From Swiss-Prot, chain A:
Belongs to the class-III pyridoxal-phosphate-dependent aminotransferase family. BioA subfamily. Inhibited by amiclenomycin. S-adenosyl-L-(2-hydroxy-4-methylthio)butyric acid and adenosine are competitive inhibitors with SAM and uncompetitive inhibitors with KAPA as substrates. S-adenosyl-L-ethionine, adenine and 8-keto-7-aminopelargonic acid are non-competitive inhibitors with both substrates. This is Adenosylmethionine-8-amino-7-oxononanoate aminotransferase. Changing residue 17 to F: Severely reduces the aminotransferase activity. Substrate binds at residues 52, 144, 260, 289, 373. PROSITE patterns: AA_TRANSFER_CLASS_3 (PS00600). Pyridoxal 5'-phosphate binds at residues 112-113, 231, 290-291. The record marks 17 as: Participates in the substrate recognition with KAPA and in a stacking interaction with the adenine ring of SAM. Its EC number is 2.6.1.62. It holds the Pfam family Aminotran_3.
Length: 410, 411
């Protein structure tokens, strides 16, 4: 990559959440292996982000590589309309078996937002088939479910209950419920579904709430006849310490959305699983179909990623990561720029009192030989499960150092 | 693929537009090469669909394959936030260079529907930035722009819907404009953008209309200061006989959407291009970012796919496909089940008077050693540009056979 290459990027290529008139530096990566990103100039960086949740087995993993290459030798893509193939079947089997008993019907899609839209369309068609006037969704404030038109309608600015005040680390307080009870009482009759991110509210605040909330929501839904949609696009596949974050409340949703880590972070794929009751009611078809539904290559990558998780090794890896993050992020509770430190599984969050200075903190991080990407008042880690203790220690040392003074804040 | 495997597919895997209470048969594909799909039972089928527009170079293409394998060797994925990489830069260079001059800012995304949602959002953020109350989109009836909620608000039934373009790809009839002008006069103050598929309305009826429509729409938008969104997710990359269908009218939109054939049908990827005016104007007031934005593997596949097109061979491959389709579909105009026949580039459409029987028709095609996937009252062909004449002949003969009587119709 030349500097002329980098100039073209600034002038012509839009990047996520960022100006075309004031783009900040972007770093050129040429390759990646294990837990390291390799920059154009040869510098190797320990990845603390898993490229946004997804790369749980890291990069250039031999099992993912082999599977993707083999699939390419067979066929990279073929349409799913009237057709089926081994990768899609092998994947859907693993998905049905690893999720709660009632979730046995699979709608594969391309992106998470699209998987959420499918979930919403599923809830709307469901009630319409019963002849009921239910077009409204009840969600939490601070929630995040995607970029698209429908996904945006249930995002922190339908009906919005307050964000869950009670914590995963701490105690349950009953006052938390008053707002969601008030909303449901007033609206039980027009509500099609409650859509929520279980335990961890990712993009909306990296909040971790007490599992009693999920227990409570599940019973209220059962009682009123209302559908529950669990958005696990960020939480699935072992990130919070359990395979799926719902397991934390011992509950099953009516509709489950998955993505990000599904393919081991090699390429995009998503899935929306539901119950037979929902799947059959709607057909009495579900009106949906992305062009690349069931992509064999993305399914093959996903199958190999799940096979690595079938060993169970991730449980110990994630538990170890949890203990190391708690121990090593704790000192930050004492720095002047930190407001809160919270860990669950392989998620380590240091919330600050003032917002960060993106360009400056990013450079500091790259200088430390680590890749860490902050947003707002949050400096967080979500590393790959195969990260070595030495590598994890480099990440926490860098975070602890960043919050030592106001050099990198505002 | 065992039978247990096939049974699990039927009871647990949703397929596009198709019931889970009354599922219809599906065919197990184990591999694909050239212009052929290979079933589990060993049967080879000539593909007439390009896996819905996308696989313009067929399957197991040695150049596409080596490119993908090489990128997997470097890295299949890395986040695009704060990071850039060779595959995305090379791709955006090609996209900017091959599209009309004003289109120079690229937003890479995953699926077509998302690319469209991005365009709509751009149009809204834009007027908001200029401080204009503009929240209506004006579109054509019979349009298709994707499956997400925003995309559906401009799919044929609050937005404005002008009558479906009547003049055919045919002489022009000024009366065709009455419905469109009326809406414009009444709501010109409130319209954020006009959004249409150029020349070919795909999923909404495989309709083929007159390029004068684009000249007029471009001129009217110019005059009122309204944004023009051209959805070329289906028509892009040579399909209609020109590189982009907008070329038929030698017009440039303010916003351009691309997908499907962008990667040569190896994996999903999409892109929305717009002008500097739009990108600078939503910037001095863009709120979008899919997780896998800029995915290196998909970008590498698109680079190798665009490199094949760089040779220019598609132009004559498509011209020859068009001559063959017109000649070989002509006999369908003598069949009792046909309502209309129309051809443009490597697209051949036989519209029927009654809806097809999917299960029965699909099986018939498979027995003829061809893969053709109809829908509603349309039996159409969009083959890979590399299809051999003997292969295209097998497709057109199967279509002609299918429309001779009631057999494969209704249900
Ligand atoms: Na299950
Ligand atoms: Na251009």
């Amino acid at each position: 990559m030349t500097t002329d290459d980098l100039a073209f990027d600034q002038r012509h290529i839009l990047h996520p959440y960022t100006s075309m008139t004031s783009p900040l530096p972007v770093y050129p990566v040429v390759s990646a292996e294990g837990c390291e990103l390799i920059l154009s100039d040869g510098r190797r960086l320990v990845d603390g982000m898993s490229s946004w949740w997804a790369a749980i087995h890291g990069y250039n993993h031999p099992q993912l590589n082999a599977a993707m290459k083999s699939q390419i030798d067979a066929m990279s893509h073929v349409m799913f309309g009237g057709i089926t193939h081994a990768p899609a079947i092998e994947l859907c089997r693993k998905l049905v078996a690893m999720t709660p008993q009632p979730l046995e019907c699979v709608f594969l899609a391309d992106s998470g937002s699209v998987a959420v839209e499918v979930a919403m369309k599923m809830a709307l068609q469901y009630w319409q088939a019963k002849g009921e006037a239910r077009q409204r969704f009840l969600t939490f404030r601070n929630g995040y479910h995607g970029n698209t038109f429908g996904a945006m309608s249930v995002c922190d600015p339908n009906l919005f209950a307050p964000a869950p005040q009670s914590r995963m680390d701490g105690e349950w307080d009953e006052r938390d419920m008053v707002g969601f009870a008030r909303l449901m009482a007033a609206h039980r009759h027009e509500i099609a579904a409650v859509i929520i991110e279980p335990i961890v509210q990712g993009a909306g605040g990296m909040r971790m709430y007490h599992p009693e909330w999920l227990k409570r929501i599940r019973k209220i839904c059962d009682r009123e006849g209302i559908l529950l949609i669990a958005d696990e696009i960020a939480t699935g596949f072992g990130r919070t310490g359990k395979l799926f974050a719902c397991e934390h409340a011992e509950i099953a949703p009516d509709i489950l959305c998955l993505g990000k880590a599904l393919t081991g972070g090699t390429m995009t794929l998503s899935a929306t699983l539901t119950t037979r009751e929902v799947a059959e009611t709607i057909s009495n078809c579900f009106m949906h179909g992305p062009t690349f539904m069931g992509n064999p290559l993305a399914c093959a990558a996903a199958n190999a990623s799940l096979a690595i998780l079938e060993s169970g090794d991730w449980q110990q890896q994630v538990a170890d990561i949890e203990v190391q993050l708690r121990e090593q992020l704790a000192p930050a509770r004492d720095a002047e720029m930190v407001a809160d430190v919270r860990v669950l599984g392989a998620i380590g969050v240091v919330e600050t009192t003032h917002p960060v200075n993106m360009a400056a903190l990013q450079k500091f991080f790259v200088e430390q030989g680590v890749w860490i990407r902050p947003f707002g008042k949050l400096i967080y880690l979500m590393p790959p499960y195969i990260i070595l203790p030495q590598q994890l220690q480099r990440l926490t040392a860098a975070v602890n150092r960043a919050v030592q003074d106001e050099t990198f804040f505002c």
